[PDB]
Symmetry: C2
């Protein structure tokens, strides 16, 4: 009698991330090198569960007596640790009780909740992100009906943060707009503002009146836990309102447990309470309450001196391994006759950098050498090991 | 100057549940009875972790070697088990590859993913739900810009399903609409269509051409795992298209791990694959990928003969305790002089029923007797025990 509701739906475009992965799997050649992954890998090319996380999970197995619903905002202790880690022990923001935190399904969940909150309860209509940025920013903000505009950030030819370009392009951003910044380890460029630059940005936001949103997914992967929050804290010291979307997917290697938070900051407790009540409403209309396991693991670790120390040591090992691969990469290319300077790799932090390779070189690297990078030329330095570095570099030299 | 973006936010109205819970916890009377809870409770008033679940969690602790991201649609084995559980092994839908399943953060997440998917990819503008229905249904669909309309369902004076009024009120639903049915254990009335009524409803849906969405959160809490899916399957045999939002929160006592799924069904494999590609985009724009822990617990239990037998016996005990409390409630009311027919309670399924008490009687019950129900008069028979039944029923008889 009646035609289907699904019949006229059009096929989505193929996901290039998934496409590249499928390709890699089908490739049977033994010396493959995967610089296209979006996760940390160790020196054996695995992504193990942290020791601190295994121990916390064992503790939970032994001690949990119920799985009953967490409240909309999740585990309160996770909320408190999050705010301490973000703003620092004895922060005036915390003291003044100006921050509210909801545990969310990852930083992605945090970004979506922020978007829905903003769309339904404020006059925000536009969100500014850096060119380039994390691939899923646009879709998340558009899904809530928010326009996404790009500001100047990376100078690709020169491998630098073009600060003057950044400042100038943001002059177009009005009070009523949101401006998104990566807390540290900018994804995918690996280049962050200096402190002084963060301070200039914080000052500008106060002057122009726009609302800062700090997406911080790599705390501890740049210079260290406290240093990586310095930028966020520059904004907190100046702007009376903030949104922070934090993730533990990477700094705890808890990717698949979906562990993060959305933190609201306002001028005072009463004001943040009103705002945060509406954030709770956006969550309720989404996934209702967040998943316990991952966030409980994090709370367990941070609340326990011994476990926290073990976690900090592993994280430090991970930050340092990435820096070691950056250094080794640059030295090995030079040793292998690269007709070009790659020292910008040393000036960058986190897993990702733009290699500067053309899409044709990327293609040739995969087809001829089984060396896999993203078509943008993005590379994940954690995909490098002391054992794969030499062939990797020989391949790159051969395509220049 | 630049005023606060949040400065002027109007607060969300308080969740009356939270106020009532505070009252309960502050109530020092030794005789208080809590019938307002939203989860299963055993005879001791606890919501324990199932044994099958603890065993699976030990297996995961001992055998998991990574936390890297799941794919957008979750664990494939969790998808397969879900489909077999819903449609039954050797189902023509499965054989024919007409179904695609995304693991989601709870049944709530699945409902939200379904709403986003529909709003962005189809002509659906309107969703029909029972009066009454699960309280969060309206918020979720509204958040995607879908209008929510109510169809006739419960006859509160007589404690029945007014099937004739249901049918008639659905004459208003149009070919392009969605109509949502509770799979079993209607929440909060506990009254489900009979199989014959289900078959009639499926026929009607083909005749009118609206899209059935089946919300199934209590499979196994009614008469049994297979019997509880009868309604859904009657729909599956008739209507070429379907959406199913399923949950493991209650039947695995996994509430806070957020384990559920959204399943799409279409006329053929090509069409569902196409639709499902768009559902994935909806997830990507939300929380990106689902949490592993709870779903992996479920997949581990259902994949292992021994674990499965342990879980089914645990669920059976739960189902049967709920039935005993319903029977004891009815008989104890008679004993204490109700003299009003409460037999409807025996004809209902799951832990919830409308007691039929007025808001005045509810108030009196709490204030005078420490018996707590929700304002709607919803009660949870799992808040009942052989030990609190007598005073509970005497309290009720006294306010009649």
């Amino acid at each position: 009698h009646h035609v289907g509701t699904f019949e006229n739906i059009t096929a989505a475009p193929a996901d290039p991330i998934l496409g590249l992965a499928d390709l890699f799997r089908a490739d049977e050649r033994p010396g493959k090198v995967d610089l296209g992954v979006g996760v940390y890998k160790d020196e054996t090319g695995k992504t193990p569960v942290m020791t601190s996380v295994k121990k916390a999970e064992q503790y939970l197995l032994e001690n949990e007596t119920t799985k009953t619903y967490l409240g909309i905002d999740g585990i309160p202790e996770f909320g408190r640790c999050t705010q301490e880690l973000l703003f620092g022990k004895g922060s005036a923001l915390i003291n003044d009780k100006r921050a509210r935190t909801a545990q969310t399904p990852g930083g992605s969940g945090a970004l979506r909740v922020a978007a829905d909150f903003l769309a339904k309860n404020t006059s925000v209509k536009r969100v500014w992100v850096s060119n380039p940025t994390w691939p899923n920013h646009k879709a998340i903000f558009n899904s809530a009906g928010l326009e996404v505009r790009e500001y100047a950030y990376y100078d690709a030819e020169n491998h630098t943060l073009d600060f003057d370009a950044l400042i100038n392009s943001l002059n177009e951003a009005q009070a009523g707009d949101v401006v998104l910044f990566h807390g540290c380890c900018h994804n995918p460029t690996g280049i962050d503002p200096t402190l002084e630059q963060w301070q200039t940005l914080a000052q500008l936001s106060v002057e122009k009146g726009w609302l800062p949103l700090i997406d911080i997914a790599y705390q501890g992967f740049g210079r260290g836990l406290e240093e990586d929050a310095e930028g966020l804290r520059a904004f907190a010291a100046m702007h009376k309102e903030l949104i922070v979307a934090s993730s533990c997917s990477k700094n705890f290697s808890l990717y698949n447990e979906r562990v993060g938070a959305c933190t609201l900051v306002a001028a005072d407790s009463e004001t943040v309470d009103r705002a945060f009540s509406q954030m709770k409403a956006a969550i309720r209309a989404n996934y209702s309450s967040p998943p316990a396991h991952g966030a409980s693991v994090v709370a367990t670790i941070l609340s326990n001196d011994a476990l926290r120390a073990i976690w900090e040591q592993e994280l430090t090992d991970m930050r340092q391994r990435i820096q070691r691969m950056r250094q080794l990469f640059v030295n090995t290319l030079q040793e292998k006759g690269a007709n070009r300077d790659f020292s910008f790799i040393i000036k960058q932090n986190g897993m990702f950098s733009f290699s500067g390779l053309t899409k044709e070189q990327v293609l040739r690297l995969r087809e001829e050498f089984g060396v896999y990078a993203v078509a943008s030329g993005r590379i994940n330095v954690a995909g490098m090991t002391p054992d794969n570095m030499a062939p990797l570099c020989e391949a790159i030299v051969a395509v220049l």
